[PDB]
């Protein structure tokens, strides 16, 4: 009986050290692992016969649906095509922002004016919106 338990404990210890080099040592994007809310910093403490871990994470709520576009292509000049970086292009519902489209973070609803920092140049596609007038990131 003791031989069996010893082997299972050794394997359990291997699991813990891998979490120390993932869930504890750095932020991780793999999901599944760590707490169930993306991953942000986690901690570990000594426990009898083992280690006790705790994890912290983001728990989103009150989801709303918004209109969004796959990308924008500046239709007065079709070779200019852009798409958001780590975020989305959404129709603007904010009174502060004159821009027809707005940029948001993907973790939280928070519209912003469109600027070059939030987008990248991409190959054209037929589903990208056809903006024939004012598109600032770069304006030309």
């Amino acid at each position, epitope marked *: 009986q003791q031989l069996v338990r010893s082997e299972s404990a050794a394997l359990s210890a291997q699991l813990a050290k891998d979490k120390v080099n993932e869930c504890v040592k750095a932020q991780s994007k793999r999901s599944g692992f760590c707490g169930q809310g993306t991953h942000i910093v986690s901690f570990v403490v000594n426990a009898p016969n083992g280690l006790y871990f705790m994890h912290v994470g983001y728990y989103p709520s009150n989801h709303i649906e918004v*209109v969004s576009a796959y990308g924008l292509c500046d239709a007065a000049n079709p070779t200019n095509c852009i798409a958001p970086v780590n975020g989305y292009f959404i*129709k*603007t*519902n904010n*009174t*502060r*922002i*004159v*821009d027809e489209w707005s940029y948001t973070g993907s973790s939280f609803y928070a519209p912003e*004016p469109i600027t070059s920092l939030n987008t990248k140049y991409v190959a054209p596609q037929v589903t990208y919106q056809n903006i024939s*007038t*004012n598109l600032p990131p770069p304006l030309l």
Partner: antibody
Amino acid sequence: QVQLQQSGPELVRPGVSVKISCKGSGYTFTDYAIHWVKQSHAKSLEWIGVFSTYYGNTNYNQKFKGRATMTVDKSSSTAYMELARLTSEDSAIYYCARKSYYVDYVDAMDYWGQGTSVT
Amino acid sequence: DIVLTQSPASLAVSLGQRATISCRASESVDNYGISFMNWFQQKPGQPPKLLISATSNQGSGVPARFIGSGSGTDFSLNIHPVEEDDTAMYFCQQSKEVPRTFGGGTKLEIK
């Protein structure tokens, strides 16, 4: 309690640039875009332009892109528009207005300035 | 922007009478069903006032009597209780595209 305070009317001679002001009151001024509209007759009106009060971003009616411009004094909670090169054809009743969304994704003028005019 | 037109140029009615205003558009205004149609009210000596929005026949500053209607190029306004303080010019407005133009309007009157 929202109010808009347009500057008084004037019989300005042509070729003079014309500044008009519209102070806001009773709301936080910087969170809403300002709009201007031109009325040449009670049945003939056209939009002039829009200016953000926080980011300073603007758009104009295509006919006014070489004409009127807008600026904002955020410390005074006030918005301004200045016409370039007045002509007798530009006499109008001018109205400032504030952006709103009574329906999601639908712009509406909400509160209006009392009106001012130039001739 | 899409051209808006309206008719009859003016209509006079008895007090409490139902009335309507046609407001055809040169091009459909629907974008994903958003419509972008607002109606405004104005009287001499005052600024235009918002009345309704395409999904708001109450609210947007008014009582339920102001009924906007239609889709595509077919818009209209229906007011079942027109009254003395409804004597005003009425203007369809387009929020879909810059310049954000709006119709020349029509005027209701009490006979």
